[PDB]
Curated annotation (Swiss-Prot), chains A, B:
Keyword Metal-binding: yes
Signal peptide: none
Highest taxon of source: Eukaryota
Protein name, per record: Troponin C, skeletal muscle
Family to which the UniProt record says this protein belongs: Belongs to the troponin C family.
Span within the parent record: 94 to 127 of 163
GO biological process: skeletal muscle contraction
Keyword Repeat: yes
Role of this protein: Troponin is the central regulatory protein of striated muscle contraction. Tn consists of three components: Tn-I which is the inhibitor of actomyosin ATPase, Tn-T which contains the binding site for tropomyosin and Tn-C. The binding of calcium to Tn-C abolishes the inhibitory action of Tn on actin filaments.
Domain EF-hand: 1-34
Annotated positions binding Ca(2+) 3: 14, 16, 18, 25
UniProt keyword terms in alphabetical order: Calcium, Metal-binding, Muscle protein, Repeat
Amino acid sequence: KSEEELANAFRIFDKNADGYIDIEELGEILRATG
Amino acid sequence: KSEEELANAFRIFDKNADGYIDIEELGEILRATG
Ligand SMILES: [Ca+2]
Ligand SMILES: [Ca+2]
C-alpha cells in the first residue's frame, strides 16, 4: 500500500529529472493532500 | 499561501539542501495533514 503510493505521488507530478521534485510540483503535492 | 510562503516550505522539506525534494522527503509532505 504505503510503498506503492509514494512512488506514484512522486511520478504523477514529477515531470523532470525525477529522482526529484521542484516548487510547482511541491505545490501540486500540497494540493493533493492538504 | 503564496510562492513566497511556499519557498520556506520547500526549504523545510529540502533537508539535503539540493534545491529539490526526493522520494523519501516526499513521504513527509504526503503525510501532511492527514
Ligand atoms: Ca520533476
Ligand atoms: Ca532535498
